[PDB]
Amino acid sequence: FLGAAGSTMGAASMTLTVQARNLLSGEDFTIDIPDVTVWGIKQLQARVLAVERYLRDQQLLGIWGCSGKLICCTNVPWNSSWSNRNLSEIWDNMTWLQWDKEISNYTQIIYGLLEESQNQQEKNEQDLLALD
Amino acid sequence: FLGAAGSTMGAASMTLTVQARNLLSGEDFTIDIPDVTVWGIKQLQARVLAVERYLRDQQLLGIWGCSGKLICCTNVPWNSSWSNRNLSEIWDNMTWLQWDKEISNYTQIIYGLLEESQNQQEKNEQDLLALD
Amino acid sequence: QIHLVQSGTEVKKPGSSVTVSCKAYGVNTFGLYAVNWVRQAPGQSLEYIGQIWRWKSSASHHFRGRVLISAVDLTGSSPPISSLEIKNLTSDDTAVYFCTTTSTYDKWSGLHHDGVMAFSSWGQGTLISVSAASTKGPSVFPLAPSSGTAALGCLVKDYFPEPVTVSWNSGALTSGVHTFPAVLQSSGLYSLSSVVTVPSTQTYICNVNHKPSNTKVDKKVEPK
Amino acid sequence: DIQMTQSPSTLSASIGDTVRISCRASQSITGNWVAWYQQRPGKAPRLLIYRGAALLGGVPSRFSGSAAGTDFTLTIGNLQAEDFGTFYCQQYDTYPGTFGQGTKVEVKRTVAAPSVFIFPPSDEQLKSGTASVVCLLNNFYPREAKVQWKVDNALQSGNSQESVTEQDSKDSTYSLSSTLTLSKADYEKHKVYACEVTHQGLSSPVTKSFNR
Amino acid sequence: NLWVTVYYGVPVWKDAETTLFCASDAKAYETEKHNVWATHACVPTDPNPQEIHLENVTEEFNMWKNNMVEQMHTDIISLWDQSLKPCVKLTPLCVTLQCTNVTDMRGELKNCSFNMTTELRDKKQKVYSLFYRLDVVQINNKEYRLINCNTSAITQACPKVSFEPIPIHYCAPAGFAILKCKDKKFNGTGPCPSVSTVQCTHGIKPVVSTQLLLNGSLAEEEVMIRSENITNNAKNILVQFNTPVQINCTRPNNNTRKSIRIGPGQAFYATGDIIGDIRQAHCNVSKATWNETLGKVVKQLRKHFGNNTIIRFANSSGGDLEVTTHSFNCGGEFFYCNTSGLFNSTWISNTSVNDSITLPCRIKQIINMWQRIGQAMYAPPIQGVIRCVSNITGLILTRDGGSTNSTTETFRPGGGDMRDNWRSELYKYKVVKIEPLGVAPTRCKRR
Amino acid sequence: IRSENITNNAKNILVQFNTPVQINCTRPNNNTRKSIRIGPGQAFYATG
Ligand SMILES: *[C@@H]1O[C@H](CO)[C@@H](O[C@@H]2O[C@H](CO)[C@@H](O[C@@H]3O[C@H](CO[C@H]4O[C@H](CO[C@H]5O[C@H](CO)[C@@H](O)[C@H](O)[C@@H]5O[C@H]5O[C@H](CO)[C@@H](O)[C@H](O)[C@@H]5O)[C@@H](O)[C@H](O[C@H]5O[C@H](CO)[C@@H](O)[C@H](O)[C@@H]5O[C@H]5O[C@H](CO)[C@@H](O)[C@H](O)[C@@H]5O)[C@@H]4O)[C@@H](O)[C@H](O[C@H]4O[C@H](CO)[C@@H](O)[C@H](O)[C@@H]4O[C@H]4O[C@H](CO)[C@@H](O)[C@H](O)[C@@H]4O[C@H]4O[C@H](CO)[C@@H](O)[C@H](O)[C@@H]4O)[C@@H]3O)[C@H](O)[C@H]2NC(C)=O)[C@H](O)[C@H]1NC(C)=O
Ligand SMILES: *[C@@H]1O[C@H](CO)[C@@H](O[C@@H]2O[C@H](CO)[C@@H](O[C@@H]3O[C@H](CO[C@H]4O[C@H](CO[C@H]5O[C@H](CO)[C@@H](O)[C@H](O)[C@@H]5O)[C@@H](O)[C@H](O[C@H]5O[C@H](CO)[C@@H](O)[C@H](O)[C@@H]5O)[C@@H]4O)[C@@H](O)[C@H](O[C@H]4O[C@H](CO)[C@@H](O)[C@H](O)[C@@H]4O[C@H]4O[C@H](CO)[C@@H](O)[C@H](O)[C@@H]4O)[C@@H]3O)[C@H](O)[C@H]2NC(C)=O)[C@H](O)[C@H]1NC(C)=O
Ligand SMILES: *[C@@H]1O[C@H](CO)[C@@H](O[C@@H]2O[C@H](CO)[C@@H](O[C@@H]3O[C@H](CO[C@H]4O[C@H](CO[C@H]5O[C@H](CO)[C@@H](O)[C@H](O)[C@@H]5O)[C@@H](O)[C@H](O[C@H]5O[C@H](CO)[C@@H](O)[C@H](O)[C@@H]5O)[C@@H]4O)[C@@H](O)[C@H](O[C@H]4O[C@H](CO)[C@@H](O)[C@H](O)[C@@H]4O[C@H]4O[C@H](CO)[C@@H](O)[C@H](O)[C@@H]4O)[C@@H]3O)[C@H](O)[C@H]2NC(C)=O)[C@H](O)[C@H]1NC(C)=O
Ligand SMILES: *[C@@H]1O[C@H](CO)[C@@H](O[C@@H]2O[C@H](CO)[C@@H](O[C@@H]3O[C@H](CO[C@H]4O[C@H](CO)[C@@H](O)[C@H](O)[C@@H]4O)[C@@H](O)[C@H](O[C@H]4O[C@H](CO)[C@@H](O)[C@H](O)[C@@H]4O[C@H]4O[C@H](CO)[C@@H](O)[C@H](O)[C@@H]4O[C@H]4O[C@H](CO)[C@@H](O)[C@H](O)[C@@H]4O)[C@@H]3O)[C@H](O)[C@H]2NC(C)=O)[C@H](O)[C@H]1NC(C)=O
Ligand SMILES: *[C@@H]1O[C@H](CO)[C@@H](O[C@@H]2O[C@H](CO)[C@@H](O[C@@H]3O[C@H](CO)[C@@H](O)[C@H](O[C@H]4O[C@H](CO)[C@@H](O)[C@H](O)[C@@H]4O[C@H]4O[C@H](CO)[C@@H](O)[C@H](O)[C@@H]4O)[C@@H]3O)[C@H](O)[C@H]2NC(C)=O)[C@H](O)[C@H]1NC(C)=O
Ligand SMILES: *[C@@H]1O[C@H](CO)[C@@H](O[C@@H]2O[C@H](CO)[C@@H](O[C@@H]3O[C@H](CO[C@H]4O[C@H](CO)[C@@H](O)[C@H](O)[C@@H]4O)[C@@H](O)[C@H](O)[C@@H]3O)[C@H](O)[C@H]2NC(C)=O)[C@H](O)[C@H]1NC(C)=O
Ligand SMILES: *[C@@H]1O[C@H](CO)[C@@H](O[C@@H]2O[C@H](CO)[C@@H](O[C@@H]3O[C@H](CO)[C@@H](O)[C@H](O)[C@@H]3O)[C@H](O)[C@H]2NC(C)=O)[C@H](O)[C@H]1NC(C)=O
Ligand SMILES: *[C@@H]1O[C@H](CO)[C@@H](O[C@@H]2O[C@H](CO)[C@@H](O)[C@H](O)[C@H]2NC(C)=O)[C@H](O)[C@H]1NC(C)=O
Ligand SMILES: *[C@@H]1O[C@H](CO)[C@@H](O[C@@H]2O[C@H](CO)[C@@H](O)[C@H](O)[C@H]2NC(C)=O)[C@H](O)[C@H]1NC(C)=O
Ligand SMILES: *[C@@H]1O[C@H](CO)[C@@H](O)[C@H](O)[C@H]1NC(C)=O
Ligand SMILES: *[C@@H]1O[C@H](CO)[C@@H](O)[C@H](O)[C@H]1NC(C)=O
């Protein structure tokens, strides 16, 4: 649970599943048996926005070239203008917190390449290749 | 956003992603910070039925031969009795609003071919073909 | 709000050791605020010296070990104070030194980049002049106009230390006056000039006050 | 160790004009770690923009940054009086941080020729054993100017010091002085001393001399 | 060469604010007594709370900017009103009170006779009660009235529920996380070398008190000194003790409950006659234990105010009763204690120039805490003598503005804001939201 | 001009203007508030 946040990106890929589990899920099944008008909304407001924030992430995962959780790849080429770096300088020498810091400017740009350039243009491409 | 509703089905396939985005998502994250007994249920009743209506659509997408959003194909043959037409008479000469109008009788029939004839009989077929 | 008050002007001789202090007013602690020491050479650009961040002193490969940055947090009688020491002073260290700080609490702020950062708050600045010289009195000479229009002024030479205040008619003549900045002569003494533009009798005068040498001497100006 | 290059070193711009000051790094900076500072004469430098486009709170909207690869540029629209001064670009991308050459934004106005005046050494100074000839340059635009010393139609190197005033508050002009420091013995060995100045205002060469 | 790839569940979080819920440890529910304090439906705590130590991580904490405090403060307030809503409202108690001096200590108790409405709306009821001097005010024999009637309304707390503080773990919903600072010495500000994460905070007893932190968490090694702005005398100084200080607060009056009937259906509990010791409420503090603590604390203040200086203690300056005295709840009753005896001392550089000590305490049934207007709560009488033993885990202190800064400094007990009380337990916690979505370049591409 | 059923006189006729009409409505009585106390805790504002 977040243990590799201080570690390098290369080491952070091993514990990736643990973060996926706990973040994704509520399974406490505790409370809500006897009603209250007051406090109960408060324990509602938190978990309702939680599932709204949850489906928000799942949409990006679906509309992109993933359609599945954890890791998935894409046909989007990595631009030189986006963090021009060494491969060993990223995973081995650099950390995720340090990484997301620089990409902050190109983050919104990259998102467009996933939904527009791919799953809009890829699925249509697939339809044309599946006809023959 | 719905801009091609008046346009032909052929042109309506380009902006398909836009409709998918906005319809799918709530990301306002506005309100619900300070509690009210009265009005608050009203702003609840709307978004709660919204996510219920949402998962309803996602189920059909899953139980059918799609398992993914936007466009996906299937092994169900198009019946002649279902809108006997010309291919250029559908996408190029006809519109979606005009299209769903005629299929209204066969809509419930087609739905059956997707869940029963395919993913019930296809996945079982897949299990028999993956053994060897 | 945030106020950075540094020490006074230090004039020190080569080979000696200098210590400047920076009092940081308005800062809750140096835990949430990184302190960087930057110097500026006269007529030249800015140069990064070192920093103290997370209570860890650091400095550029230029000054490694030769520069010592120490700081103490907020106390009950005074705001957080940092101090910079430079031993083995040379003539190239005469740059103006600045005490700076930056808010590090925001983890996704563009201000900082893992030790290397920008500088949000700037101090008053502290000038360090490195020269081997003893205090001396100013020499005042008149500059007489020969004859377009006319121009006359007074010349102040060989004084130490700075500054000196030059007036005209005891502040009566405030217009058309341009006072040139002191120049450092090869002898280690300062020299400047004050000139006034006159058209076409009034018999102007010069008012010179040098406080370190306590010389209030005043010289007149006569046309040849 | 990055080296930041600014262009130009100084520029002339008027009020209302749109000023663009660029900067280039020895390598490509990505993540856009670049800062732009403003410094008024006699005052401490103030932070304006960080991360190349991100403006600090309290700064007018007239300032706009741009950051792409090796090339960086700061854009200032609708120039005003308080904006004039010296600007520096800085990279915090890597240890340690390095600044740029600096860019002096200087007030624009019609080019003005200086009025040159030359002052012979005072009598009391001659008794000290030294003689200083002072060449004067009155209000002139821009600051850049040349002053050479000819003794009996011969140039002099060394023993020469010049001084320049700050830009005038209203006139927006500069003033320049020139100091020639020589001994008494060498002073008596020559006859005519001349001060040669060249500036954009003159549009001709000027020389002021005295026959003592 | 490479290609972009979506990673889900990357270790990335950002500082944010969310709505936190409670946890009761699933034992407090078996404690029953008809919804003690918070716990009614309160969430059962996970029997095995998880604490994950994050290696190679340094996070900067600020306890004064912590948002968990503001929620907890509003929680106790919101919790308070909901307890008073179903209960019996005392509205027609504003009847004139004819009082007289009780049979010593300048007649602190008043025996009051008054007219009252019965179950029937026809005939009134002539009955007497016993109120403390703080609960009544005369209006011009001796005639008195309720002290709260001119200011606000009033309602009686139900005898079924108890004000007894029970451990409450604050936890975060899905998508969020809570950071814990594991260092032994932490003042609440600056970077934290060792940081761990937990789903639920530790056991926190919402004990509302003034001038004394009661039933709190002990510090590690040296005692801790915490203040928002230290050199500023306008900001209170929070102290955390190492060893707990034994404190005794009792009600040396053995009482009885009248349980008068003001129907239909409602019954008020009046204070009957006192049978037992004739005494005023008192608070005991062991002279040896307080002194030992004081000597260790006074040395810690000199890590700021300088190695050598004179530090003098004195009782409260002045203000509301809640500020000037030690206010708390024991056995359902609300005590207000005089701390002037403990704070009378003068210390040298390392030293200061009997077997017990006592502190006179006053009792007030009708209270408005948190500067609340419109709602006043009446503390119901308790059968028998109440005795309680608690830990003193810290103080709320203020520094004088008079300076003479380079000479000497004097410190006095603070009060007012109850958020400081919660900041005492919440200094090591803060709320952040986790960002799972991430992108990284790799060769895999796609077919 | 808008109406649900026009020829029907039982239905109201809604009109929408082009240019706004300036209207002034004032209370030409300069008053004071008594703020009488009908406690405990409640206070009514009477017209003085
Ligand atoms: C809350 O809480 C928190 C926590 O809990 C807290 O925090 C805290 O804080 C504090 C403050 O207050 C702190 O403390 C501090 O610290 C600092 C720092 O330290 C560090 O550093 C240093 C320096 O460094 C450098 O050097 C070295 C040498 O050695 C090296 O090595 C390094 O590296 C560096 O260097 C660098 O640089 C260079 C250039 O520059 C280059 O070249 C290179 O390369 C690099 O980069 C050091 O020294 C140190 O060390 C030490 O220590 C340690 C421990 O700590 C140890 O380990 C070591 O070994 C050593 O030790 C020694 O010493 C000590 C001292 O004390 C002792 O103790 C021991 O025993 C031994 O002996 C470190 O590393 C510092 O700086 C400071 O100090 C200060 O203070 C004190 C008192 O306290 C004093 O005494 C001193 O002196 C100082 O003072 C100063 O300053 C001031 C201001 O500025 C002034 O005023 C004065 O006067 C002074 O000055 C003087 O001196 C100087 C010199 O120094 C000179 O210059 C002048 O002139 C004069 O003479 C302090 O200490 C802490 O730490 C913290 N903690 C933690 C945990 O972190 C807070 O505070 C709270 N808050 C509240 C409100 O409460
Ligand atoms: C947390 O709490 C702490 C304390 O508990 C708070 O700290 C307080 O922080 C404030 C900052 O908001 C401080 O006030 C500021 O003080 C500075 C510095 O003043 C001192 O030094 C001056 C110069 O000292 C040098 O020079 C002399 C002469 O050579 C030397 O001998 C010295 O050794 C030094 O080298 C000196 O002039 C000052 O004295 C004057 O002021 C004091 C205090 O009022 C008087 O007692 C004196 O008699 C004398 O009058 C002092 O010794 C000031 O520079 C600040 O002034 C700015 O702000 C004023 C508004 O308060 C404003 O009116 C001024 O014009 C001035 O603003 C100028 O500077 C700005 C920044 O550059 C410009 O933007 C602006 O345009 C203008 O040019 C200010 O007064 C408090 O002193 C400090 N508390 C204590 C006890 O020291 C902290 O704020 C709290 N923070 C939080 C988050 O809670
Ligand atoms: C919105 O608002 C509007 C108005 O604001 C509402 O409009 C109103 O709509 C109702 C319909 O529900 C109308 O009533 C109906 O009128 C018709 C027509 O009546 C006129 O014409 C008759 C014939 O005219 C021709 O023939 C002569 C002779 O050659 C020529 O000279 C003419 O020029 C024509 O060519 C004529 O006979 C009528 O006169 C009689 O009625 C009027 C009105 O009461 C009297 O003043 C006269 O004196 C005279 O008695 C008239 O001029 C009628 O045919 C309708 O009658 C049906 O409904 C009756 C119930 O109301 C029922 O009792 C009848 O038996 C009859 O039902 C017959 O027809 C049905 C359909 O075929 C059959 O299913 C049924 O079994 C049976 O066979 C009816 O009276 C209103 O007139 C009209 N308002 C106005 C002002 O005109 C509208 O309803 C509103 N809508 C909404 C949604 O809000
Ligand atoms: C800081 O922390 C400390 C420590 O955690 C806090 O101190 C706590 O204070 C609580 C009271 O507020 C106290 O709760 C008490 O627990 C006692 C022990 O219970 C256990 O033992 C009994 C057997 O005796 C078991 O059955 C039970 O299941 C438990 O295992 C109880 O004995 C206490 O009840 C008595 O005290 C309270 C007030 O303190 C009365 O309201 C209550 O009615 C009881 O008083 C009657 O009984 C005693 C004798 O037991 C008589 O002397 C007395 O006069 C009363 O008798 C009359 O009244 C009753 C009805 O009230 C009637 O039936 C009878 O006939 C008479 O008419 C109480 O339940 C915690 O135990 C205690 N903590 C610890 C560790 O002990 C402190 O409060 C905290 N600070 C703050 C600010 O909250
Ligand atoms: C707040 O209140 C609490 C609770 O009352 C106080 O804490 C208690 O403090 C007392 C005294 O300081 C302490 O009582 C002693 O506890 C010992 C065990 O820890 C007992 O052994 C001892 O009993 C002996 O002494 C009594 C009185 O003299 C006798 O009545 C008793 O029979 C005992 O005598 C026996 O033992 C001797 C040998 O030692 C033998 O020769 C005899 O034959 C006989 O067998 C005391 O009772 C309590 O333990 C403390 N309680 C707690 C929980 O710590 C606190 O001090 C108060 N604070 C203030 C400020 O007033
Ligand atoms: C690279 O990504 C960076 C992400 O942070 C970009 O930084 C952001 O850039 C925008 C561009 O204009 C800034 O927008 C301006 O913001 C200021 C100040 O906003 C902040 O401060 C106020 C004042 O306290 C605070 O209330 C806000 O919540 C902000 O946190 C506004 O005054 C302007 O009107 C304008 O909106 C962002 O402020 C800035 N920082 C952020 C978002 O934290 C950077 O620009 C990107 N680089 C490039 C080249 O585009
Ligand atoms: C205030 O704190 C001081 C300590 O700073 C306390 O002084 C302590 O006094 C007692 C005696 O009353 C000492 O006990 C003695 O122990 C010695 C050694 O065992 C023994 O020979 C004596 O007969 C006596 O029992 C105690 O040691 C001493 N503290 C220290 C640290 O030495 C003082 O008691 C406190 N205030 C009060 C209320 O006394
Ligand atoms: C408080 O005053 C009431 C009277 O208002 C006392 O009650 C009386 O007590 C005497 C005993 O001396 C009886 O003879 C009376 O009949 C009682 N009258 C009523 C109305 O109860 C009461 O005793 C006083 N306080 C106490 C109980 O000490
Ligand atoms: C709290 O304790 C102090 C200290 O004992 C009390 O101060 C006494 O006040 C009375 C007047 O009310 C004086 O006659 C005494 O001389 C004071 N005592 C001392 C030692 O000076 C104080 O009264 C107590 N309670 C309150 C409510 O103030
Ligand atoms: C990379 O980005 C630059 C500017 O952002 C753009 O000009 C270029 O076309 C991009 N290249 C690719 C392959 O996307
Ligand atoms: C009762 O005691 C009070 C003290 O609170 C005193 O003021 C009053 O005079 C006493 N009444 C009588 C009748 O003695």
Residue numbers in the entry:
A (entry chain D), B (entry chain D): 522 to 653
C (entry chain E): 1 to 147, 153 to 205, 210 to 233
D (entry chain F): 1 to 30, 30A, 31 to 211
E (entry chain C): 33 to 135, 140 to 176, 187 to 399, 408 to 501
F (entry chain C): 271 to 318
Text from the published report:
The functional Env is a trimer of heterodimers, each containing a receptor-binding protein, gp120, and a transmembrane fusion protein, gp41, which are held together by non-covalent interactions. The cleaved Env trimer engages host receptors to mediate viral entry and is the primary target of protective humoral immune responses. The mature Env is also metastable, as it is poised to undergo dramatic and irreversible conformational changes upon receptor and co-receptor binding to mediate membrane fusion. In this study, the HR1 bend was rationally redesigned to stabilize the prefusion conformation rather than to destabilize the postfusion conformation as in the SOSIP trimer.
HR1 redesigns 1 and 9 were selected for crystallographic analysis. These two constructs differed in their redesigned loop lengths (8 versus 10 residues) and SEC profiles, with a higher dimer/monomer peak observed for HR1 redesign 9, which provided an opportunity to examine how HR1 loop length and design variation affect trimer structure. Co-crystallization with antigen-binding fragments (Fabs) of PGT128 and 8ANC195 yielded Env complex structures at resolutions of 6.9 and 6.3 Å for HR1 redesigns 1 and 9, respectively. Overall, the redesigned trimers showed nearly identical structures to that of the SOSIP trimer at this modest resolution, with Cα root-mean-square deviations (RMSD) <0.25 Å. Thus, the results confirmed that gp140 trimers with shortened and redesigned HR1 still adopt a native-like prefusion conformation. The limited resolution of the crystal structure allowed us to only determine the approximate backbone conformation of the redesigned HR1 loop, but nevertheless provided insights into how these two distinct designs stabilize the prefusion trimer. We speculate that the shortened loop (8 or 10 versus 21 residues in WT) and redesigned sequence disrupt the heptad repeat motif that extends the HR1 helix in the postfusion state, thereby stabilizing the prefusion form. Furthermore, both HR1 redesigns contained proline, at positions 2 and 6 in the 8-residue loop and at position 8 in the 10-residue loop, which likely increases the rigidity of the backbone. Of note, Asp 6 in HR1 redesign 9 is poised to form a salt bridge with Arg 579 of the neighbouring HR1 helix, stabilizing the slightly turned loop (right). Of note, HR1 redesign 1 showed an almost undetectable level of monomers and dimers, whereas HR1 redesign 9 still contained a small fraction of impurities.
